């Protein structure tokens, strides 16, 4: 139980029972815990995303202006509660504690020639065009792309 | 030993089409996702009758070519096959490249063989639940 | 083995529509919430007769396309289907984009397939209690 | 003791073609891969009828030459063989070098002997699953 | 168990249990392990590819500007996750750990005279022509080649 | 077996089985060995 060997591209979560704070331990590493601490589960794979695919993770980590994971003072991680975030192809990231993988690795959809997509703005945002897309607007995404 | 006369009992008034052994529900819910409503109420019934008539013609050609014997037009059922082929060859020109855009195959020969179930269906294709939802 | 003659016994005088196997109560209380009273007393009866006639036509088209065979207009019941389709195609132009605004689907083909019960209903849609209140 | 009259019961109206003992499904899915859809809907039915008629003629010539006795045109079935040979020799000129490009052999004599199953099929050839998918 | 004799043109994978890091050992060599270490499987052949044939290996090794296999600091190898790479005829390469051989030795296909190939760009790339081939484009590869 | 906790003012000896070389580990420390290595005896007092 005390001996923890994380394979390459895996992770675990371990519970500091002196603080009730959990965190992720990644790497091709061996891990040695303490007596208070408790590894939650057997080491699972850092989930990876191929090209022309995506996934959505509920409750994403708040990262800074450079993408460094922001933490609480108490050792806990700064999430963004009840959001989603769509992740594209990149290195096999881990999942910080308090994150659920809702959409799996699903393919980016291809629209054929002479066919288009009907798209609705669920929530207000600001697109790359410069338009204040109010929630409820309708879209025509046409093309063979 | 397929029903032959029972098909002509279900022959429509213009030349359009159990006796088929295919998931009807599942095919309609499959075509509902792809955007058949945007072709007009009149248009979607014409397209569904086109696909059903092509399915009946592919079933007939499969029945014939097991014994070896748009171009398909037995002497006793030659009239219905002739008028069905003439109904096919008229309204097909309204829809160029419709089987790729509806995600059914390259052309109608590739589409009806997959929908009938005698030819394999790839994993990159979403036509896997048209034969297996009837298996559940 | 659906009742065929028993439908024509319940055929109305103008061309509008158990034999349907659907929650009537629940559908009326569903449409009561969406604001059908604000369309006028005369208007809501016309809309309910429109939706019932579209439901009967979708039941007929489901009965036909299991054997393979506004555009829908057997020879023995061709007259009632013809006059029902002519009743549909006249009063439909009074209501453009009425199935989104009443929260039933994209168009009538998407709406009647969900209300009949052969196609799935999403969680983002409030049409989950029209088939399950009859299950309670 | 092959069925002779039962072939003429399945004789088509123009001169084109169990009684053959061959994987029909598997051959159609084999020709689906090679790109028969790109020859037109009208074209693929003409080509399939050509290949079926050549298969029937090769079966006839195998039946005859076991007793020793385009050039093939018994006196009682001489009319059907004559009109089948005339149907073959007309539409064959539309397709020069079609059996190499469809990967079936050098010419039609090499192709129909391999497809009938009396002659060996090499490992460099993809025609190994037309006789063994019927064995599975 | 301790004695490992790798035949000529074979390989194994051995697990450093002090680091949870694996690597490949190739050659016509004898191998002697340590007490921590663990050889994963019996020695398999370095897979070879004849002329006019190919194979595709999922998760290829990141090689440098000269083709030298790049490693992690922790002894692990730099893969490229969830990709493929099509390998043509060459010396019998080994498979580094974390690589799966999806396509076997399969022949390069020959197109006949008066016949062509329909080719679709699955993902955006840049061909040898100079064209930015956007994903979804269609191709005609004609010829007897 | 893998977990070694040396009390204050104690020691052990551990055998490197890759080298056949032993050495002493002292202190009020916890000790973690490897798979080759083998602690010879229970921790005795300096």
Write b or e for each residue in D112-130: b if 16 or more Cβ atoms lie within 10 A of its Cβ, otherwise e: bbbbbeeeebeeeeebeeb
Work out the minimum CA distance from E33 to partner chain F, whole angstroms: 9
Whether the CB of A17 is below 8 Å from some CB of chain B: the reply is no
**DSSP per residue, D40-56:** -HHHHHHHHHHHHHHHH
Do B91 and B70 form a contact (C-beta atoms < 8 A)?
A: no
**How many Å apart are CA C61 and CA B64, to the nearest integer?**
29
**How many Å apart are CA B68 and CA B62, to the nearest integer?**
10
Per the document, the length of chain D is: 136
Q: Residue A112: its chain B contacts at CB < 8 A?
A: 100-101
Q: Residue B4: its chain D contacts at CB < 8 A?
A: none
Residues 31-50 of B with CB under 8 A from C: 32, 36-38, 41-42, 44-46, 48-49
How many CB atoms within 10 Å of residue C65?
Answer: 20
Considering only CB atoms, which residues of chain E are within 8 Å of chain A?
Answer: 17-22, 72, 74-76, 81-83, 98, 122-123, 134-136
CA dist E125 to B41, E85, E119, E121, Å?
41, 14, 14, 8
For A33, which residue in chain F has the nearest alpha carbon? F3
Mapped onto helix, strand or coil, the DSSP state of residue F24 is: strand
Q: Among A64, A69, A59, which residue's Cα sits nearest to residue A26?
A: A69
DSSP B38: G
Mapped onto helix, strand or coil, the DSSP state of residue B116 is: helix
How many CB atoms within 10 Å of residue A3?
Answer: 12
Do E62 and E99 form a contact (C-beta atoms < 8 A)?
A: no
Whether the CB of E66 is below 8 Å from some CB of chain D: the reply is no
Work out the minimum CA distance from F15 to partner chain A, whole angstroms: 20
Work out the minimum CA distance from D114 to partner chain E, whole angstroms: 20
Longest dimension (CA), chain C: 42
CA dist C39 to A80, C26, C98, E115, Å?
45, 20, 12, 64
CA dist D62 to C45, D58, D72, Å?
75, 6, 12
**How many Å apart are CA E38 and CA E42, to the nearest integer?**
11
**DSSP per residue, A62-84:** PB-TT-PBPB-TTS-B-B-TT-E
Work out the minimum CA distance from E118 to partner chain D, whole angstroms: 10
Residues in Cβ contact with B41 at an 8 Å cutoff, skipping those fewer than 6 apart: C70, C71, C92, C107, C108, C109
For an interface test with D, which of B50, B58, B71 has the most D Cβ atoms less than 10 Å from its Cβ?
B71
Work out the minimum CA distance from D61 to partner chain B, whole angstroms: 16
For B109, which residue in chain D has the nearest alpha carbon? D37
State yes or no: chains E and F have 3 or more CB pairs below 8 A: yes
For an interface test with E, which of F1, F33, F36, F39 has the most E Cβ atoms less than 10 Å from its Cβ?
F36
Chain B to chain C, count of Cβ pairs less than 8 Å apart?
Answer: 66
H or E segment and range at residue D30? helix D24-33
Whether the CB of D97 is below 8 Å from some CB of chain E: the reply is yes
Q: Residue E122: its chain A contacts at CB < 8 A?
A: 52
For B117, which residue in chain D has the nearest alpha carbon? D25
For an interface test with E, which of F15, F34, F38, F39 has the most E Cβ atoms less than 10 Å from its Cβ?
F34
> What is the structure's resolution, reported in angstroms to one decimal?
2.9
Q: Among B16, B122, E3, E20, which residue's Cα sits nearest to residue E12?
A: E3
Q: Residue F2: its chain A contacts at CB < 8 A?
A: 2-3
Instruction: Say if the Cβ atoms of A7 and E18 lie within 8 Å.
Output: no
Q: Residue C78: its chain B contacts at CB < 8 A?
A: 13
Q: Residue B101: its chain A contacts at CB < 8 A?
A: 112-115
Residues in Cβ contact with A126 at an 8 Å cutoff, skipping those fewer than 6 apart: A132, A133
Exposed/middle/buried for residue C89 (C-beta within 10 Å: 0-12, 13-18, 19+): middle
Do F11 and F44 form a contact (C-beta atoms < 8 A)?
A: yes
């Amino acid at each position: 139980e005390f001996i923890i060997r994380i394979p390459p591209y895996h992770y675990i979560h371990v519970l500091d029972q002196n603080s009730n704070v959990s965190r992720v331990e990644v790497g091709p590493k061996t891990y040695i815990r303490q007596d208070n601490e408790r590894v939650l589960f057997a080491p699972m794979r850092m989930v990876t995303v191929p090209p022309r695919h995506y996934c959505t993770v509920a409750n994403p980590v708040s990262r800074d202006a450079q993408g460094l994971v922001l933490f609480d003072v108490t050792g806990q991680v700064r999430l963004r509660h009840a959001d989603l975030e769509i992740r594209l192809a990149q290195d096999p990231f881990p999942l910080y504690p308090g994150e659920v993988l809702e959409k799996d690795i699903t393919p980016l959809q291809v629209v054929l020639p002479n066919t288009a997509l009907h798209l609705k703005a669920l929530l207000d945002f600001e697109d790359k065009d410069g338009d204040k897309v109010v929630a409820g607007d309708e879209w025509l995404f046409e093309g063979p792309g | 030993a397929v029903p032959w006369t029972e098909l002509l009992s279900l022959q429509t008034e213009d030349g359009f089409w159990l006796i088929l052994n295919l998931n009807t529900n599942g095919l309609h819910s499959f075509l509902k996702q792809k955007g058949i409503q945007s072709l007009g109420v009149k248009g979607r019934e014409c397209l569904l009758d086109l696909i059903a008539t092509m399915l009946v013609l592919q079933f007939i050609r499969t029945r014939l070519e097991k014994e070896g014997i748009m171009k398909m037009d037995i002497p006793w059922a030659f009239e219905a096959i002739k008028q069905a082929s003439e109904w096919v060859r008229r309204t097909e020109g309204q829809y160029p490249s419709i089987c790729p855009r509806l995600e059914l195959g390259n052309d109608w020969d590739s589409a009806t063989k997959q929908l009938l179930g005698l030819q394999p269906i790839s994993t990159v294709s979403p036509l896997h639940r048209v034969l297996h939802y009837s298996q559940g």
